[PDB]
Design an enzyme around this catalytic site. Structure first.
Site, PDB file in Angstrom:
ATOM      1  N   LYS A  70       5.668  -3.369  20.639  1.00  0.00           N
ATOM      2  CA  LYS A  70       4.477  -2.842  21.301  1.00  0.00           C
ATOM      3  C   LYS A  70       3.833  -3.913  22.194  1.00  0.00           C
ATOM      4  CE  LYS A  70       1.320  -3.832  17.523  1.00  0.00           C
ATOM      5  NZ  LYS A  70       0.084  -3.333  16.866  1.00  0.00           N
ATOM      6  N   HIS A 123       2.787   1.562 -13.998  1.00  0.00           N
ATOM      7  CA  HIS A 123       1.382   1.160 -14.074  1.00  0.00           C
ATOM      8  C   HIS A 123       1.439  -0.184 -14.785  1.00  0.00           C
ATOM      9  CE1 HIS A 123      -0.143   5.041 -12.685  1.00  0.00           C
ATOM     10  NE2 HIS A 123       0.851   5.550 -13.396  1.00  0.00           N
TER      11      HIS A 123
END
Ligand SMILES: [Mg+2]
Ligand SMILES: [Mg+2]
Ligand SMILES: [Mg+2]
Lengths: 225, 56, 224, 291, 96, 98, 228
Positions: free
Chosen positions: D85, D268
């Site tokens: 970009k 978790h």
């Protein structure tokens, strides 16, 4: 540690002299904790056989395998001749040392019950009122430590055979299947509307369900306490 | 840097927390006891250790 | 690798002691505390009343005319008698008590014996009323642990009452292990041991005896 | 030189380096924003006679609580079939792998909805263990079952006990599976394997096993009058065993349900969740700590 | 629990007043480097480092233990604030 | 097995054949047609959640494979079976509050 | 009436298994003696363990090797199972060299022999090499106690070396058995049997002995009291 053994071998025999009782126990005819009456005393072998001078002696006996914490026995504690288990004496001592006041501690506990949620909550509250929050905090930590310790080694577990299906269940279902047919007949011959038949089937099953709950718990209470 | 951290620093930390309290909180905080003060004890491990009697 | 631990003692007379061993390698708190506790409660040599005879008493559940206590209560008070043998030779005595009239019999009233010390002479044994008479002979043996009266069942005569034998001079043992750290060694043990005795042996003596018994048993892994 | 030790010639950390919190993964410099130095800085410069450099350190560093081994670098620079970009001259990506051992605060679960965080990792000598010396792996609390009503996990454990000693696995289809009698047959076979081994090796029943059988008789779990072996077998068919406390050598006072269970470690992990801050970035408009 | 907390709550008409007294005292000890303490050397709270036992650094711990001796005075309008500050600077000079 | 199969958590033999090459990186199989098909193995790839996608070969050189036989285990696969954790030895009892 | 020294009996199978009987003992001393020794045996007996691994052309653990079936994580798992006996008590560390190629199934047998070093499980599978596969390893084996994770010790002899989790204990399993026995007229006496399984690095009896010694030395620590 605060529940007591209730045994069935002795089954309510009568005896004249305590030595007759101890001999019957020696022969294997009366369980240590079975309720008997020695000269109409309504006692048990353990209370006559084991007579401890103080809590230390009874707990030393427990350490040596003589009796278990749930065996009912006689102990001399604070100038009283108590018929109680060594486990309830140990619980009294836990409270007493946590709060450092043997007399108040004795007033605070209910000695002749198994300790459970409500009796322990009442103990915490009375301790708060009588001794303040510092001592009540130490009581709470002591109860935690000893409850955790004793639950580890107690033998509590869960297997499929611990969900005991009582016999009465089958009877209560057969009975129910009978009454259902009855109700069905009354609907066939226009005696019941649909709504009434529905309400009656539901009432039948509500009551049967309560009956089997009572039977489950009565089976536990009488045969697997 | 983590590999720069010495040992006497953990001792210094222990003097820092002496008699001090931290606040522990569990959301949703439904009444005031959703927050309580505790004297921290330093541990290895990455979990907070909570006392059994305050869980309710 | 770990530095030899420091051993810290805290005593209150002859009756109570707390003992602290830190630092210990992980796990050695209960590794040491459980055997020592087992030993302190079972194998420390002491003495105990093993048998009682009382004039005009048939069995244990009898009552005594003119004495306030029942026989059960006198036996309970006798189980609390702390007797110390001064001569390692001696193994068993018989102590004698005669008294009458209104009086409170203590442990002092026993007729003394050669190389027999009574640590708790103010111990109450019984109260007698007007015309109350107390004639008893009590057998005192050396031993260990705890032996129910029926177990030993000893009887010099037909109406002698066998007494549960509380040999153990140690009344109670409690220990606790706490995590502690030496620098950044994080899971070390601190053992705290608490010992209650009747006073004939001190807590510290009882402990030295328990460690000696254990060390000695460890020497049995020697000669097949 | 210690801070740059594991940086490659171009300033990218090398494959295989161990990176810890604070360590540089990609060195980068940025030109400084036009600033007149505060008079204190002017004086401190004069005291040390050192020209303030024109670029500052804006490198990519391993964030707190992360790290591991560098296993890949990708280097896309412009001017190289590569176009980025507008205005970016190069992108660098560094891949870091960690092996994560189970630790205190990690979440475990079974297929019946039993879930829990690891609270304690015990050395093996503290674990409850079988008479043959085999320690158990995990200790689940019985208080998790009655109000949860998930008894599949108990049957699983019973059948796991059988499988443990028979060296076998099972397919028990839902609503069409193993029933209690078939599980009891398998537990009888497994008992023969578990106990006849002992009876052959030259050992009898332990004193502690006798104490637990005495308690079991009072609990209604074994038939009075049968031999030690027959009562142990009744217990085993209920999926229970005598268990020794590794801290004492004394038996748990009742027989305990023991068996194989399938347990998962869930995503978790406390490694990812632990976080603390003293000070740090604040929001533009509100000037409140960022989240 | 804080040592003596039940007696400390016994000393005040409102629990919040104890917290005000404790906090103001703690600030006073910090301001004067603990030279204004009413504790005797053997009553000083201690903290066990690796080197050995030293003074507890926590001024709230100090303040509570001082409150428990009866040697502090608390209440409203005991003394004008500036007179109090200046007399404490006189008796116990602040580090410079 | 069907879950492992439908989710492409494993490589399977395309037709009957014989294994010619086996690597941590790739498996080459000679099928009945005589054609030599090569299967690259994805090794320590990063999933959307950072868990590791890698395939491990479960055959050996010279082994005869029929259509649909397992060539490689993917993540959470053990010999073609869904492998979401471990089988551990469990005791059901309280333990000191922990 | 005070019981005295019991008989000590030893039964051994190879270097792997041992039974150690002590009888008779006073009531309750089966547990008092068995369990402290079980705790020490399982936690504190010095042994040997692979602590580090260098493989040529491998930069880190998360790798493959052309011509080798196993990834490196699996190869390190295999080496964690290597049992190495040091015959010289002074030796703290050894680097075993392995150089293999061609089609073959490399076992632990394939390391280069070293003075005073014995591999106790030479059939341990290490790696499957294919036609064209090459494996060139240096594995570092150390003496140690207990369980030391790779993260804790960080041992690397060279730059690309992989640290390995070290479980040093040579003790695989410990049980003990307390059986009823009697002597003359005494009842409820204990017969103690320690059952010790090791890896062969150190024999059951050697383990029992240094366990007894560790306990004895700990009992020494009560010797010099101090006032609180
Ligand atoms: Mg009796
Ligand atoms: Mg009361
Ligand atoms: Mg510890």
């Amino acid at each position: 540690i605060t529940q007591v053994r209730k045994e069935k071998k002795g089954a309510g025999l009568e005896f004249a002299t305590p030595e007759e009782a101890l001999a019957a126990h020696e022969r294997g005819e009366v369980a240590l904790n079975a309720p008997i009456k020695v000269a109409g005393r309504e006692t048990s072998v353990g209370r006559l056989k084991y007579v401890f001078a103080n809590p230390d002696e009874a707990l030393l006996a427990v350490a040596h395998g003589i009796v278990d914490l749930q065996d009912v026995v006689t102990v001399r504690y604070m100038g009283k001749r108590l018929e109680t288990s060594p486990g309830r004496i140990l619980f009294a001592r836990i409270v007493a040392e946590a709060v450092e006041d043997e007399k108040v501690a004795w007033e605070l506990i209910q000695l002749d019950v198994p300790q459970e949620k409500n009796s322990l909550k009442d103990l915490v509250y009375q301790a708060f009122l009588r001794l303040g929050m510092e001592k009540t905090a130490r009581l709470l930590d002591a109860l935690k430590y000893y409850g955790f310790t004793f639950s580890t080694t107690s033998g509590i577990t869960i297997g499929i055979d611990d969900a005991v299906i009582p016999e009465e269940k089958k009877q209560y279902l057969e009975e129910a299947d009978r009454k259902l047919l009855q109700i069905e007949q009354a609907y066939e011959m226009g005696f019941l509307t649909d709504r009434e038949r529905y309400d009656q089937i539901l009432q039948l099953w509500t009551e049967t369900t309560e009956k089997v709950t009572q039977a489950v718990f009565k089976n536990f209470e009488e045969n697997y306490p | 840097r983590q590999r720069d951290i010495k040992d006497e620093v953990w001792d210094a930390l222990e003097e820092v927390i002496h008699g001090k309290v931290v606040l522990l909180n569990r959301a949703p905080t439904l009444h005031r006891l959703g927050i309580q003060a505790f004297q921290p004890v330093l541990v290895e491990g990455q979990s907070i250790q909570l006392h059994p009697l305050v869980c309710e | 690798k770990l530095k030899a631990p420091v051993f810290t003692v805290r005593t209150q007379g002859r009756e109570y002691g707390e003992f602290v061993l830190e630092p210990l390698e992980r796990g050695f708190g209960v590794t040491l505390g459980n055997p020592l506790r087992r030993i302190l409660l079972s194998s420390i040599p002491g003495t105990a009343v093993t048998s009682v005879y009382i004039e005009d008493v048939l069995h244990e559940f009898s009552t005594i005319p003119g004495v306030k206590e029942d026989v059960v209560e006198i036996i309970l008070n006798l189980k609390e008698l702390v007797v110390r043998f001064l001569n390692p030779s001696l193994q068993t005595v018989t102590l004698l008590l005669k008294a009458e009239g209104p009086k409170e019999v203590k442990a002092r009233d026993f007729l003394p014996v050669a190389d027999v010390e009574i640590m708790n002479p103010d111990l109450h044994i019984a109260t007698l009323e007007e015309g109350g008479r107390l004639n008893m002979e009590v057998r005192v043996d050396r031993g260990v642990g705890y032996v129910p009266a029926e177990k030993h069942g000893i009887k010099d005569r037909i109406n002698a009452i066998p007494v549960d034998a509380v040999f153990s001079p140690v009344r109670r043992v409690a220990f606790q292990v706490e995590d502690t750290r030496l620098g950044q060694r994080t899971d070390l043990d601190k053992l705290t041991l608490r010992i209650w005795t009747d006073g004939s042996v001190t807590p510290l003596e009882a402990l030295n005896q328990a460690v000696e018994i254990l060390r000695e048993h460890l020497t049995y892994f020697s000669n097949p | 030189e210690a801070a740059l030790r594991d940086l490659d010639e171009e300033g990218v950390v090398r494959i295989g380096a161990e990176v810890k919190p604070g360590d540089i993964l990609v060195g980068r410099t940025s030109f400084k924003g036009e600033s007149e130095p505060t008079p204190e800085e002017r004086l401190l410069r004069s005291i040390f006679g050192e020209k303030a450099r024109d670029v500052k350190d804006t490198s990519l560093r391993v964030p707190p609580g992360e790290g591991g081994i560098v296993v890949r670098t990708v280097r896309l620079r412009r001017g190289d079939g590569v176009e980025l970009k507008p205005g970016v001259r190069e992108v660098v990506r560094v891949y870091v792998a960690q092996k994560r051992k189970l630790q205190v605060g990690d979440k475990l679960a079974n297929r019946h909805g039993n879930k829990g965080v690891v609270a304690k990792i015990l050395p093996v000598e503290d674990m409850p263990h079988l008479p043959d010396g085999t320690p158990v792996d995990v200790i689940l609390n019985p208080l998790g079952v009655p109000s949860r009503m998930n008894l599949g996990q108990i049957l699983e454990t019973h059948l796991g006990l059988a499988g443990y000693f028979l060296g076998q696995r099972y397919i028990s289809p839902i609503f069409d599976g193993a029933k209690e009698p078939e599980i009891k047959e398998l537990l009888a076979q497994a008992f023969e394997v578990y106990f006849g081994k002992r009876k052959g090796e030259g050992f009898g029943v332990d004193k502690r096993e006798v104490e637990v059988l005495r308690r079991a008789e009072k609990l209604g779990l074994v038939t009075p009058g049968k031999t030690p072996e027959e009562q142990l077998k009744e217990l085993f068919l209920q999926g229970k065993v005598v268990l020794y406390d590794g801290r004492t050598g004394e038996p748990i006072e009742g027989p305990i349900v023991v068996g194989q269970m399938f347990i998962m470690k869930l995503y978790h992990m406390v490694e990812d969740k632990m976080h603390a801050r003293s000070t740090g970035p604040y929001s533009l408009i509100t000037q409140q700590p960022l989240g | 629990a804080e040592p003596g907390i039940d007696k400390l709550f016994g000393m005040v008409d409102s629990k919040y007043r104890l917290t005000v007294v404790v906090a103001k005292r703690a600030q006073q000890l910090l301001r004067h480097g603990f030279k204004n303490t009413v504790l005797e050397p053997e009553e000083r709270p201690k903290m066990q480092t690796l080197e050995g036992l030293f003074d507890d650094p926590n001024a709230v711990t100090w303040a509570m233990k001082e409150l428990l001796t009866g040697r502090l005075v608390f209440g409203e309008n005991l003394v004008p604030e500036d007179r109090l500050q200046k007399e404490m600077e006189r008796l116990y000079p602040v580090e410079r | 097995e069907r879950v492992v199969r439908d989710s492409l958590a494993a490589l399977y033999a395309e037709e009957d054949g014989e294994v010619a090459k086996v690597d941590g990186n790739r498996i080459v199989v000679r099928y009945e047609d005589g054609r030599l098909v090569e299967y690259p193995l994805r090794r320590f790839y990063r999933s959307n959640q950072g868990t590791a996608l890698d395939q491990r070969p479960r055959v050996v050189v010279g082994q005869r494979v029929r259509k649909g036989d397992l060539l490689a285990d993917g993540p959470a696969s053990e010999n073609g079976f869904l492998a979401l954790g471990q089988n551990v030895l469990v005791a059901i009892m309280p333990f000191d509050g922990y």
